[PDB]
Amino acid sequence: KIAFLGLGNLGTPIAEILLEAGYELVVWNRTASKAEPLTKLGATVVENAIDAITPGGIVFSVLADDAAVEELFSMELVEKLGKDGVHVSMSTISPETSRQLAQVHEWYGAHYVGAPIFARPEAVRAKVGNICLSGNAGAKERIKPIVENFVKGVFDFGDDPGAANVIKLAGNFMIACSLEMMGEAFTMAEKNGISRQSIYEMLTSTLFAAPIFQNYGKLVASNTYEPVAFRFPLGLKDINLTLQTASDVNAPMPFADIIRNRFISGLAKGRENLDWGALALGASDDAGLT
Amino acid sequence: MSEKIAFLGLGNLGTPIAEILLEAGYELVVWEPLTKLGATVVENAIDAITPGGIVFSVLADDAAVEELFSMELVEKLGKDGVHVSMSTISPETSRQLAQVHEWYGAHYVGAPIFARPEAVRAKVGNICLSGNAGAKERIKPIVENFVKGVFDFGDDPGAANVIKLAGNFMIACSLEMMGEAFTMAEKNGISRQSIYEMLTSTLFAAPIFQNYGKLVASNTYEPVAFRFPLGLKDINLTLQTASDVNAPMPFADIIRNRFISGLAKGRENLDWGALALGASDDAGLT
Ligand code: NA
């Protein structure tokens, strides 16, 4: 019944909840072995993504980037999805990529729903994550009861298929700013003979007592960016999507320029295998603490 | 009770702190509405000081504190005297004053406060303390009456001041990132209110984001809690502090320019939250 394309760190747990909730899934992944835990839960697997699509049915996708979504959602695949078909596109991609693809879906009477997820894999299993939806109202109304199974909050951002994507980029931009201001602040404290952990504990106990600052603050305090939750080069990819998006509506983003340079400089320093949180090491570099 | 306390400075934070100490039973010599609850007023601050006693000060800036804590007054505070300094001042001013205090056998405690006037009135605020161990042991029971959390940052008399400036810096950064993000959304045809509501009820669900985010979402920087030029003064203390320990602060440089440009645009009478208008100006929305 429901096609599910892309079974990475988020696709796997998302698909497991939809199977547990009684939905029939036909799944696919570029790496075929990732789908076998879902076959035990009732799902069916196919060798080619187009074999998973039902004319007028629902297809979910969760892929790494803009090129992965465009490569998969070819004209011939979208045409099979066809009239009244609905694509719930959960990848973190550009508003422009979403609006372009949404346009192609409407050629065949199908609907593209921009559905970026605000959840790390643990938050999905715990169903404490959130989703933003944008696109056709009838199509959002059809899939809203499905996505309620793996998130707490569902936020609607209207008709524009790329609007929810703007919110996701803005959210990730604010996370990156939080990392940077803590790097700066904790380095200033450190060079003043104050432990990074003590300033972190005080400030996030009170003023900055939100999950982003407590989870990311511990990384910045210890300045240990291993194990990896999101690979370092992927932070650069995301801030560049934000900068492109803002530039296209003539909006400067001075903080985002600084974040971008932290990633570029970090790659010059051989930090490609660290977590994206390691952008916060730039403040340590500049203050001579390498 | 036993401690007859000198309370110097009675502004927006000074008055509600002095109130709680008067209601808790402490005898206060301030420097008229506190005379009503049981205090005694003096004309010259030095006459409020008891040798070996305790003095609280909460003053508007570094200048106000150094001018009041002269060699004369600190000598009068003298042997075993304790000064609890609650002003948002630079660590350098605290460290300089502290050396003056110990030359005459007194102790300076850096004790900047993290609270709006309403958090003080509720005993919900936090305070950071640093300075001499014995002095903090003496005044902790007194500060516990008007704060919830007490955080000890050791012997360095300016270390608590570093935490305070870092906190104010992170608040300014939060205003700036919401200005940038909400302006990007806005120019993509999304209301500032909708992006604000989603992000500040999930990822950024802390009063700092929900309270300042509302101001940034409507670009209405009211009521005036902290005048715009005080934002520039505070970010300048952070930048000086960071420079003295050879630490660049690139976000703070951006914050500073938002205030300088706002003053060029005549915003001196708006709330410091209006630093967030910069993103709108740059995106051609003002
Ligand atoms: Na739910």
What is the per-residue DSSP string for A63-105? -SSHHHHHHHS-HHHHHHH-TT-EEEE-S---HHHHHHHHHHH
Q: How far apart are CA B213 and CA A41, in angstroms?
A: 43
Closest partner residue to A187 (CB to CB) among B204, B209, B247 is B247
Q: Supply the DSSP symbol for B60.
A: S
Measured in Å, residue A132 CA sits from the centre of ligand 1 at 13
The CA distance from A90 to A11, in Å, is 9
Distance from CA of A131 to the nearest CA of B (A): 10
Runs of H (alpha helix) within chain B: 14-23, 62-68, 71-77, 91-103, 117-122, 133-143, 159-187, 192-201, 207-218, 228-244, 250-264, 277-282
What's the A122 CA to ligand 1 centre distance in angstroms?
15
Beta pairing, strands B82-85 & B113-114? unpaired
| B171 to A202: CB separation less than 8 angstroms, yes or no | no
- Closest-CA residue of chain A to B116: A207
Given B164, B214, B233, B265, which residue is catalytic?
A: B164
Q: Please answer whether residues A81 and A61 qualify as being in contact, where contact means their C-beta atoms are separated by less than 8 angstroms.
A: no
* CA–CA separation, A73 and A107 (whole Å): 13
Provide the 3-class DSSP secondary structure of residue B84.
strand
Nearest CA in chain A to B180: A253
Ligand 1: centre distance to CA A152 (Å): 4
Per CB-CB distance under 8 Å, the chain B contacts of A159 are none
Other Cβ atoms less than 10 A from the Cβ of A99: the count is: 18
How many C-beta neighbours within 10 Å does residue B137 have? 10
Identity at A17, one-letter amino acid code: I
Amino acid at A58: I
CA B106 – CA A12 distance, rounded (Å): 65
CB A55 within 8 A of CB A9: no
Q: What angle do CA B132, B137, B140 make, to 5 degrees?
A: 110
Q: Domains in chain A, start-ordered, CATH in brackets?
A: 1-156 (3.40.50.720), 157-290 (1.10.1040.10)
Strands (E), A74-192: 86-89, 111-114, 117-118, 130-133, 153-156
Catalytic residues of A, by residue number, are: 168
Q: Scanning every residue of chain B, which has its alpha carbon at the shortest distance from the alpha carbon of A216? A: B203
Residues 6+ apart with CB under 8 A from B17: B7, B56, B58, B86, B113, B120, B146
Determine the angle formed by the axes of helices A163-191 and A95-107, rounding to 10 degrees: 170
Q: What is the resolution of this structure in A?
A: 2.0
